[PDB]
Amino acid sequence: SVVKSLNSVNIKCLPTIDPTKLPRHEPILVTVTARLNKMVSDKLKGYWASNDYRKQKEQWQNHLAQLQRGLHLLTDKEYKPEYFSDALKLDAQLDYSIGGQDLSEIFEELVKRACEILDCKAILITFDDIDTQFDAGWDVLESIRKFFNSRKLVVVATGDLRLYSQ
Amino acid sequence: PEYFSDALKLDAQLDYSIGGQDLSEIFEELVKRACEILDCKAILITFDDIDTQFDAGWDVLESIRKFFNSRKLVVVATGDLRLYSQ
Amino acid sequence: MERFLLNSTVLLYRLSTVSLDEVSLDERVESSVFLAQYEQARSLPDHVAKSAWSYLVQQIKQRNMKLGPVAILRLIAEKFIKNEKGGPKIDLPMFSEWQTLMSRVSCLPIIACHQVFNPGPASQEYSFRWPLYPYHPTVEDYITRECLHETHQHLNGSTSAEECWLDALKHPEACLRDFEKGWASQEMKQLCAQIDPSLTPRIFKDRLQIACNIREILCRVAQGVELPEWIASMQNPQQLANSTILHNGREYGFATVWPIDDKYSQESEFCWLTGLLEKWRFNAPEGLERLLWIYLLIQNQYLTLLVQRDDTELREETEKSYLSRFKHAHGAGVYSQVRYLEGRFAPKSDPNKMQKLLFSVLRGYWEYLSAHMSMEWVHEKPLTISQVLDNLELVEPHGKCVELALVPHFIKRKPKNGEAYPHALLFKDLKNQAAILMDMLKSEPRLTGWIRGVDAAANEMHAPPELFCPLFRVLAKSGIAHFTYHVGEDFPHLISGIRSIDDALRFLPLRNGDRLGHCTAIGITPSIWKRSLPLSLSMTKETRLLDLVFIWRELRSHPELLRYASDAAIEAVRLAHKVFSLEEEVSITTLDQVFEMRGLLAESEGLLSELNEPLKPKSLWLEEYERARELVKTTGMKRPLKLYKQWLTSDNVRKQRAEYVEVALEYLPDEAVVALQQAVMAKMADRNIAIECPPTSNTRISQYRNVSEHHIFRWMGLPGEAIEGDVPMSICLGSDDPGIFAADLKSEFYHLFVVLTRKFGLSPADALRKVAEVNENGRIYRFHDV
């Protein structure tokens, strides 16, 4: 009902996601980036090589490469020492809150860049039931408290709150 | 991934009874050829006891009920059934 | 001087650190050009050099352009590239200079420059994948009738070196690790500082990252779109080392989106570059003009580094790149330009690793057939070894498509000290590697029709050729049925190099129809070999002793070169006392008998292990083990054998062998060395064993002043280059390590044809026949099954 209501300021409605309907080892931030990327790739392909299209897509490809390295440590279980020499990188642009490679400020701009491109003032992420298998719901709870903190994003979850307590 | 492309392979001849991937029906077709070459009406398999190591005897029983189905192969089994029951 | 503005270490340094805004750099490039040309061609006099650079300067002023890549390529494009019926080709008189140029400059920009400024007729659809070849009607029609027959291609890797540059762009992190892993070894450290001392693993990532970012920046200019406004914060190319440029504190980046999906493809680079030079046909902004200069300098630098380093990425590059390789070898047109191709590959110890690569090559070859042989296969998607062989048994050789015959080549290694005999760790790996090959071949016996040959191409001083006798002979019983060796290319002394080939002839189980690789030892004229060498060389005692015993073998037979034979036999006995530390008398006959038994395996029973040992369980090796055992026990003569055990398992003898000795350069007179070389020819021509010839564009010998002096002409029998008394051999054609960037067998075929017509003055009809004999010898001695 919520996604239908907001599909009519303007709040973009993501297709509803659920950790239950996914491979167990799959993270949550990687999915929301994937789920957001398809919703920005569909619009840009609508332009089909316009002057504005090239400028906007150049902004997107530049930013995603920034997220790939910082998140790449989370992709693999063991964190190799080679990342530390590669993890460190001087940059004053994008308003890095803290150095190294941290996704708290990188992903906020990624959410931001969607808003100018999609001409929307808010980003909505809707979830489904995790009562089916709440063991994997911890990574959702960690991602929502770590990489969901921008004033221009809204996140909607559901379920039985006692299972969260459990 | 190499197993994935190893399976799901398209064969149009030999008239497989079961579609997709299956070991039981190809094994029976294999049994057919062995029976005809050795001009026998049927082929007999005789199994021994599992008293010393019946941990593998669980594999013996499953293989019989997984792959030994058709009439052209007949099995002779031995062993105290109460050992099999446990 | 057009070849020093595109491959020059100091110019890259003198332009990378220079900010883009300043333009006055003629005095800095000119100082760089002379310095760079000095460290490359030291023999070029200054007065010629100073005049040459000034001539280039006023030529640009005459053409009314600005000094830079956009102008340098134009002069080369109008110099070398000339349009013809087949499109853009290279003129015959200046083909040889182009091959000299190609060792320093990648051709891809030149064709891109040539196409923009000197396009083809009626803008006919042009697709560039292969390096440019010269046109000659007498030769091009010979290829159409009788296709080329290649013999030595390393399938490990891509087709040429120019596209490997794109792979370095595609895998910046992997190519850094491969360079860093090599940089750990001292040889690469010397080699990198050899090309450029100011090179560090930190710098190599810097240089590659700059090239990638420059590629993105110029692509925006090539697309015609305006710059993304962060070029205001662009002051130095060092900014292009981080992929992140900050302007007014706002986030930015260098990457863009390309019209084609695969930005790192051969087509993408050509469309980018042709588009870029199209928009600079009249004038170019200086800041971006220099940026193109850096990219070409970086591109040539890595290509220069790659070629020398050749004389991880392998796993990623060894999957379905073979289909491109065969398509590259096939060439344009309905029918392939190369019919009989012998692709070599390096076996690996782990059976899963070796099985995976063998399937990839065979599957890749089938994909090449399926694009041409539009005919129904048994399996449409093989995806396994068995279904590939069943599919491949349905094709017939009708002289149009490439025919393949894989040949694994072992890699020799340094002799590890210890383990009771010289190469134990080395032989244990080789024994294991061949064991994986032989059992896997027995698992699928149909592979004997494709796995045809065995080679060993690492070096010569590392492991003597006689070490492969037991491992080859067992492989002969395994069904390989063809043995080739990569022998005689590197040697410490010319007479010693003759011994190495004759070690291969006498010891290796070479049957009639086998081949040898890079027999440079019997090729170089001794007068030519002595050019620019010290008056006394150095070589290991063991290599010296095997020389002295050999020189007695082939010279006492010579009625007039007896003094050398007699002196050698006398002083070889002197050296044997030094090495073996023996006190009794040993004659030259005993020494030869000792050295004729070095082909036996060390671990043969009764030779190194205890004679009374229980019998091993009937391997393919028990024939080898007992054969070296019984003949040692028999003949009633064990005195040479006990000398041989010290030659293998004595602490002092092995140490004395590795101790170096001083040998005069002209130990044998000029005629004396020729006697050995003509003795090899008579022996091997009797055995009828062909010789692989390296590409003549390979300036690896560092002894020939030009191509016209190459030893291949001596073998073929060119008047004025053939030594009297030579026994003509059979010489096949091969292109393994050409030493240049973009090469192919057809280019090598043309290179040989050009030299005969121009330097030696031969008619085109007669010149073709001499080079056609080499191209056909690759077919007479083909390893492909009948």
Do B10 and C383 lie within an 8 Å CB cutoff? no
Do A62 and C246 lie within an 8 Å CB cutoff? no
User: Is the Cβ of A8 closer than 8 Å to some Cβ of chain C?
Assistant: no
Q: What angle do CA C250, C255, C261 make, to 5 degrees?
A: 145
Nearest CA in chain B to C380: B10
Calculated CA dihedral for residues B9, B14, B20, B21, nearest 10 degrees: -80
Q: What angle do CA C246, C247, C252 make, to 5 degrees?
A: 55
Query: Cα(A114)–Cα(A107) distance, rounded to whole angstroms?
Result: 11
The burial class, CB within 10 Å (0-12 / 13-18 / 19+), for C416 is exposed
Quick one: resolution in A? 4.0
User: First-to-last CA distance in chain A?
Assistant: 28
User: CA of C178 to nearest chain B CA: how many angstroms apart?
Assistant: 27
Query: Cα(C6)–Cα(C23) distance, rounded to whole angstroms?
Result: 19
The amino acid occupying position C446 is R
Positive/negative CA dihedral, C365, C366, C368, C369: positive
The amino acid occupying position C574 is R
Query: Cα(C292)–Cα(A77) distance, rounded to whole angstroms?
Result: 42
Give Cα C567 distance to the centre of its chain.
39
Alpha carbon separation from C129 to C153, C217, C373, C588, C748 (Å, rounded): 18, 25, 22, 60, 17
Do C381 and B6 lie within an 8 Å CB cutoff? no
The amino acid occupying position C515 is R
Alpha carbon separation from C439 to B2, C212, C397 (Å, rounded): 22, 46, 29
Do C381 and B9 lie within an 8 Å CB cutoff? yes
* Consecutive H or E run containing C746: helix C745-758
Among C523, C525, C577, C517, which residue's Cα sits nearest to residue C548? Answer: C577
Query: Cα(B81)–Cα(B54) distance, rounded to whole angstroms?
Result: 12
Q: Which long-range contacts (CB under 8 A, 24 or more apart) does C254-258 make?
A: C254/A62, C254/C212, C254/C213, C254/C216, C254/C217, C255/A58, C255/A61, C255/A62, C255/A65, C255/C216, C256/A54, C256/A58, C256/A61, C256/C216, C256/C219, C256/C220, C257/A54, C257/A57, C257/A58, C257/A61, C258/C219
Mutation target among A85, A93, A95 for the C interface, most CBs of C within 10 A? A93
Length of chain B measured in residues: 86
Query: Cα(A68)–Cα(A71) distance, rounded to whole angstroms?
Result: 5
Do C383 and B5 lie within an 8 Å CB cutoff? yes
Query: Cα(A113)–Cα(A43) distance, rounded to whole angstroms?
Result: 13
C518 three-state secondary structure: coil
Burial C87-107 (b: 16+ CB within 10 A, else e): bbbbebebbbebbebbbbbbb
| Residue tagged 């290599």 (tokens) | C543
Can you read off the two tokens belonging to residue A12?
Answer: 């973009």
Can you read off the two tokens belonging to residue C679?
Answer: 């003795």
Do C244 and A55 lie within an 8 Å CB cutoff? no
Can you read off the two tokens belonging to residue B34?
Answer: 């062995």
Chain C residues within an 8 Å CB radius of A63: 251, 253
Alpha carbon separation from C639 to A162, C602, C625 (Å, rounded): 92, 17, 20
Which residues have CB under 8 Å from C427's CB, separation 6+?
Answer: C467, C471, C602
User: Is the Cβ of B5 closer than 8 Å to some Cβ of chain C?
Assistant: yes
The amino acid occupying position C14 is R
Chain C residues within an 8 Å CB radius of A89: 242, 244
| Residue in A49, A54, A93 nearest the CB of C249 | A93
Strand partners, A155: A125
Nearest CA in chain C to B2: C383
The burial class, CB within 10 Å (0-12 / 13-18 / 19+), for C27 is exposed
Contacting chains of C (3 CB pairs or more, <8 Å) are: A, B
Q: What is the DSSP letter of C398?
A: -
Contacting chains of B (3 CB pairs or more, <8 Å) are: C
Task: Give the strands of the sheet with C515-517, arranged side by side.
Answer: C484-486, C515-517, C690-693, C731-733
A31 three-state secondary structure: helix
User: First-to-last CA distance in chain B?
Assistant: 39
Mutation target among C383, C388, C391 for the B interface, most CBs of B within 10 A? C383
Could you tell me if C158 and C317 are in contact, meaning their C-beta atoms sit under 8 angstroms apart? yes
Query: Cα(C387)–Cα(C394) distance, rounded to whole angstroms?
Result: 12
By DSSP bridging, strand C403-404 and strand C731-733 are unpaired
Q: Report B:10-69 residues touching C (Cβ under 8 A).
A: 10
Mutation target among C209, C226, C251, C252 for the A interface, most CBs of A within 10 A? C251
User: CA of C380 to nearest chain B CA: how many angstroms apart?
Assistant: 9
Give Cα C310 distance to the centre of its chain.
7
Which residues have CB under 8 Å from A54's CB, separation 6+?
Answer: C223, C225, C256, C257
Do C383 and B6 lie within an 8 Å CB cutoff? yes
Query: Cα(C60)–Cα(C71) distance, rounded to whole angstroms?
Result: 7
Query: Cα(C370)–Cα(C380) distance, rounded to whole angstroms?
Result: 9
| Residue tagged 């080859």 (tokens) | C472
Can you read off the two tokens belonging to residue C708?
Answer: 């016209």
Breaks (C-N over 2.5 A) in chain A follow: 8
Can you read off the two tokens belonging to residue C409?
Answer: 């080549």
Can you read off the two tokens belonging to residue C336?
Answer: 């392939």
Q: How many CA atoms lie within 13 A of C176 on its CB side?
A: 17
Could you tell me if C594 and C640 are in contact, meaning their C-beta atoms sit under 8 angstroms apart? yes
Query: Cα(C325)–Cα(C692) distance, rounded to whole angstroms?
Result: 21
Breaks (C-N over 2.5 A) in chain C follow: 311
The amino acid occupying position C60 is I
Query: Cα(A156)–Cα(A160) distance, rounded to whole angstroms?
Result: 14
- DSSP letters for A41-79: HHHHHHH-S-HHHHHHHHHHHHHHHHHHHHHHHHHSSS-
| H-state helical runs in C664-722 | 670-687, 712-716
Query: In the A/C pair of chains, how many CB contacts fall below 8 A?
Result: 51
Query: Cα(C487)–Cα(C521) distance, rounded to whole angstroms?
Result: 9
Breaks (C-N over 2.5 A) in chain B follow: none
Question: Phi/psi zone of residue C210: left (φ > 0), alpha (ψ -120 to 50 degrees), beta?
Answer: alpha
Strand partners, C410: C456
Can you read off the two tokens belonging to residue C417?
Answer: 């000290």
Can you read off the two tokens belonging to residue C66?
Answer: 């600005």
Query: Cα(C551)–Cα(C549) distance, rounded to whole angstroms?
Result: 6
Query: Cα(C737)–Cα(C311) distance, rounded to whole angstroms?
Result: 9
Question: Phi/psi zone of residue C171: left (φ > 0), alpha (ψ -120 to 50 degrees), beta?
Answer: beta
Query: Cα(A102)–Cα(A87) distance, rounded to whole angstroms?
Result: 9
The amino acid occupying position A100 is G
Can you read off the two tokens belonging to residue C402?
Answer: 């490439």
Calculated CA dihedral for residues A114, A116, A117, A122, nearest 10 degrees: 50
Which residues have CB under 8 Å from C322's CB, separation 6+?
Answer: C155, C343, C360, C361, C364, C365
Strand partners, A123: A12, A153
| H-state helical runs in C264-350 | 266-278, 286-310, 313-317, 321-330
Do C383 and B9 lie within an 8 Å CB cutoff? yes
* Consecutive H or E run containing C665: none
Query: Cα(C378)–Cα(A76) distance, rounded to whole angstroms?
Result: 41
Alpha carbon separation from C443 to A121, C355, C379, C439, C448 (Å, rounded): 66, 11, 21, 6, 11
Length of chain C measured in residues: 786
The amino acid occupying position C466 is E
Obtained via which technique?
A: cryo-EM
C86 three-state secondary structure: coil
Query: Cα(C419)–Cα(C648) distance, rounded to whole angstroms?
Result: 10
Can you read off the two tokens belonging to residue A85?
Answer: 């020499």
